[PDB]
Design a protein around this ligand. Sequence first.
Ligand SMILES: COc1nc2ccc([C@@](O)(c3cncn3C)C3CCN(C(C)=O)CC3)cc2c(Cl)c1Cc1ccc(-n2cccn2)cc1
Ligand SMILES: COc1nc2ccc([C@@](O)(c3cncn3C)C3CCN(C(C)=O)CC3)cc2c(Cl)c1Cc1ccc(-n2cccn2)cc1
Lengths: 214, 217
Amino acid sequence: ASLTEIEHLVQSVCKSYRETCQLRLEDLLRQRSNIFSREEVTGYQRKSMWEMWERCAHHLTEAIQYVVEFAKRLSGFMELCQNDQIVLLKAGAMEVVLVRMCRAYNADNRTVFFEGKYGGMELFRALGCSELISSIFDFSHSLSALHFSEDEIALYTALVLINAHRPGLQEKRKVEQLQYNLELAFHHHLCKTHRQSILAKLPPKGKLRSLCSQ
Amino acid sequence: ASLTEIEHLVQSVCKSYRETCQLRLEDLLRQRSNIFSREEVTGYQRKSMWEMWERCAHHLTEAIQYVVEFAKRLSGFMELCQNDQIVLLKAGAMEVVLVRMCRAYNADNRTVFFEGKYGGMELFRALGCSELISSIFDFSHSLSALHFSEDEIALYTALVLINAHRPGLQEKRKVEQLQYNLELAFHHHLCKTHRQSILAKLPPKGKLRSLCSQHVE
Ligand SMILES: COc1nc2ccc([C@@](O)(c3cncn3C)C3CCN(C(C)=O)CC3)cc2c(Cl)c1Cc1ccc(-n2cccn2)cc1
Ligand SMILES: COc1nc2ccc([C@@](O)(c3cncn3C)C3CCN(C(C)=O)CC3)cc2c(Cl)c1Cc1ccc(-n2cccn2)cc1
């Protein structure tokens, strides 16, 4: 793996994400001044369980199909066999969406962007699982403290996705060195931007699997 | 700091540790087979409180001296001001020693290499510190479960020593610069040897410090 090749891999991943980031960051950052009123939050807390679970399920399905088109533009992901691709997505697509959701999180007032405005974890009271919504906020709070750049999110979520330890793979070691060159490109780019201080502040991926299982 | 330069950094840390590891790992596995007899274990249990904390203090001062030379061979450490070097050493050296003792530990029979042979925690009965000795054995048993390589230990102890969160540093940004590079060197090496799974199974931090507040006299 030549130096100029891993530097092209950084770019390749960084534009695959910018093309499939669903929402542009500058639109998320200028909308946090806009906040749900107390009357509007009431309207969400009054919604039934079914209606509230089904809205969020439609936003997850929408976000997951942006993650799929993010993997299908990764150089190397297309080359893997069709079974390994579905295995890597059916296990890593949900974890990528959670990492992507930190761009919509505003640590000032502890709110996330949802269906037009920014709102705290009061909106999702109708779901009946405050502890799951709470840990999603506390995880998003951790990623927001680092101020992750779009390129850092692009390379990180790629490593979340391309992991050669998922059960069910067949051409394992072909996913291994593909995972390695993404580790190479991620470690590479962090040096150029002097951002290697975030690696120790990165959550363990035991947490992400734990949240998705719930 | 390029990636090839932290490639240099990984090799330099694994070289300093090799030159300053006090006991060779292969000799510890060879000495692993020979174990204290009960007649010998009793001989230690009859020693004084003073006679037994005089030997360990000699071994702890001897082992700490190897940690100093380890740091003095890490380049980057030697170009810090001496006030920060001392501060890092008084807070770090004893905790490096606790991590290095995991190599002298045998999980098959909960024994450890001490003064010639292997012995259980009953060997240190004369100290009267049954929970400190038990906390150490509990700590080494968790580290031996990860099968630390001689290079994973080298990089982990380098991070244990180089911490910008120490009180008393004033050129603090100088330290975290060297600390951030050792973090990437640690991750970049765990990738090369397919060993990132040990990042999660590492002790929490504040766990070695809770193993060194246990130290009045
Ligand atoms: C804390 O709960 C939530 N937080 C969210 C934060 C941001 C966003 C987005 O802003 C966004 C930004 N980038 C990507 N996403 C998904 C949404 C973009 C689309 N959108 C438009 C355009 O209005 C709605 C808003 C959606 C959230 C949702 Cl649906 C939720 C709700 C939620 C419920 C359950 C889970 N779960 C169960 C198991 C594992 N996990 C996860 C989550
Ligand atoms: C369970 O207690 C101990 N375990 C030990 C395990 C191994 C070794 C070595 O094998 C070794 C290997 N690598 C490095 N070390 C230190 C010793 C090499 C030297 N040696 C030769 C050549 O015979 C004696 C053996 C020494 C131990 C000692 Cl002294 C002890 C005793 C001890 C008591 C208290 C503390 N404490 C107070 C505050 C924090 N902690 C620490 C310790």
